[PDB]
Design a protein around this ligand. Structure first.
Ligand SMILES: COC[C@H]1O[C@@H]2O[C@H]3[C@H](O)[C@@H](OC)[C@@H](O[C@H]4[C@H](O)[C@@H](O)[C@@H](O[C@H]5[C@H](O)[C@@H](O)[C@@H](O[C@H]6[C@H](OC)[C@@H](O)[C@@H](O[C@H]7[C@H](OC)[C@@H](OC)[C@@H](O[C@H]8[C@H](O)[C@@H](OC)[C@@H](O[C@H]1[C@H](O)[C@H]2OC)O[C@@H]8CO)O[C@@H]7CO)O[C@@H]6CO)O[C@@H]5CO)O[C@@H]4CO)O[C@@H]3CO
Ligand code: NI
Length: 57
């Protein structure tokens, strides 16, 4: 109901073909430890480390 939107607590740089870079404060919508997410800044989709993000509006 709102547990699928998150905000980045730390910067993250992509390592592979499937992960998603993001900056601290960037909001992510979620589509385990790695979550498929869409950046609400760039609209790009990829996997993010779930411990790098926290619930957000
Ligand atoms: C230019 O104005 C036209 C547009 O204006 C209004 O849109 C606003 C929008 O409401 C507003 O949102 C709050 C903001 O948008 C931001 C997005 O919300 C945010 O997610 C991000 O956007 C991302 C996307 O998520 C990514 O997908 C990507 O987009 C690029 C596309 O990659 C998939 C790429 O293909 C290319 O898009 C083309 C598009 O092809 C898919 C093509 O479609 C025909 C054409 O788009 C038309 C569109 O059809 C038409 O729709 C009615 C209209 O759109 C207006 C919205 O309706 C209006 O809403 C209020 O005109 C478009 C332009 O002619 O052209 C596209 C551009 O080439 O390029 C995409 C851009 O790279 O990356 C983006 C950016 O990160 O950021 C958005 C803001 O940058 O702003 C919008 C206006 O800029
Ligand atoms: Ni929810």
């Amino acid at each position: 109901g709102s547990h699928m939107t998150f905000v980045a607590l730390y910067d993250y740089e992509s390592r592979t073909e499937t992960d998603l870079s993001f900056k601290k404060g960037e909001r992510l919508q979620i589509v385990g430890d790695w979550w498929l997410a869409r950046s609400l800044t760039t609209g790009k989709t990829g996997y993010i480390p779930s411990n790098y993000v926290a619930p957000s509006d």
